[PDB]
Amino acid sequence: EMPFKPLVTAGIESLLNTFLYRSPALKTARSRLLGKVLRVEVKGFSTSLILVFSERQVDVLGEWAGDADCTVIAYASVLPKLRDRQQLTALIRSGELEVQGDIQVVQNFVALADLAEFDPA
Amino acid sequence: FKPLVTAGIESLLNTFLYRSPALKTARSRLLGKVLRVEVKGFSTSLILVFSERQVDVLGEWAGDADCTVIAYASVLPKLRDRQQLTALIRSGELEVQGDIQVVQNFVALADLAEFD
Ligand SMILES: [Ca+2]
Ligand SMILES: [Ca+2]
Ligand SMILES: [Ca+2]
Ligand SMILES: [Ca+2]
Ligand SMILES: [Ca+2]
Ligand SMILES: [Ca+2]
Ligand SMILES: [Ca+2]
Numbered sequence A: 001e002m003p004f005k006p007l008v009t010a011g012i013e014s015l016l017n018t019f020l021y022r023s024p025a026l027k028t029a030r031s032r033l034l035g036k037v038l039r040v041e042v043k044g045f046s047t048s049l050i051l052v053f054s055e056r057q058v059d060v061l062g063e064w065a066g067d068a069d070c071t072v073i074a075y076a077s078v079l080p081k082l083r084d085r086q087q088l089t090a091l092i093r094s095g096e097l098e099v100q101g102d103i104q105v106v107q108n109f110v111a112l113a114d115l116a117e118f119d120p121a
Numbered sequence B: 001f002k003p004l005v006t007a008g009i010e011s012l013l014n015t016f017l018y019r020s021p022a023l024k025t026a027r028s029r030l031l032g033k034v035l036r037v038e039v040k041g042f043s044t045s046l047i048l049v050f051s052e053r054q055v056d057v058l059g060e061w062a063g064d065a066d067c068t069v070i071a072y073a074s075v076l077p078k079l080r081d082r083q084q085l086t087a088l089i090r091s092g093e094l095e096v097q098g099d100i101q102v103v104q105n106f107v108a109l110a111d112l113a114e115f116d
Helices: A004-021 A024-031 A076-081 A085-094 A103-118 B002-018 B021-030 B073-078 B085-091 B100-112
Strands: A037-042 A048-053 A058-061 A070-074 A097-101 B034-039 B045-050 B055-058 B067-071 B095-098
Touching (some): A004 A024, A004 A048, A004 A058, A004 B002, A070 A076, A070 A103, A076 B073, A085 A097, B002 B021, B002 B045, B002 B100, B021 B100, B034 B073, B034 B100, B067 B073, B095 B100
Parallel strands (some): B034 B067
Antiparallel strands (some): A037 A048, B045 B055, B067 B095
């Protein structure tokens, strides 16, 4: 029997790495996140998601004893809305997404996801 | 993006439910069943097709499901406890269409797959 939570964090990590780190065209967009710790608190879920950005991959953890550079709090249904910085600004303004710490981290993350969709690799 | 998401969900479900040979008789209750999962707020459906070897997940399905479940994402981790599924249906947190036995068997299997 494999516990559920580590399987979920491993799955998210695999998805993020294939989507964001596989293409070398995105290197300059990923550089903006190097060394950043982004904590994601999904409302209604009892656990946190912590994304640690390095040069060759992002690591996803279910716990983090240290400091996060940016912390985002939102319901899961906000994720398909994070299409670009415009939508991100509207979500912050409406209170659908709450940001603590460095707002630039989540702006750079959303910008990277936007470019990852643009880039056909 | 959709085939990457479904492949990830398929891998998660198979490692969680299909890895242990001890669960074979519990999985047999779902053989040939199709379970559609509509996560509220998301534009796409998740379709789970149960076979003896594995569960297959698809993002698109030209067909009917034996059972369809509709809920917000936060209700999804509450689906590994068979005794609370009735409470979720009663509270309206989980809406069920079609054959209720399919989701009951799925939750019973998910409960047996995990130490509390
Ligand atoms: Ca890792
Ligand atoms: Ca501190
Ligand atoms: Ca830091
Ligand atoms: Ca976009
Ligand atoms: Ca791409
Ligand atoms: Ca049966
Ligand atoms: Ca259990």
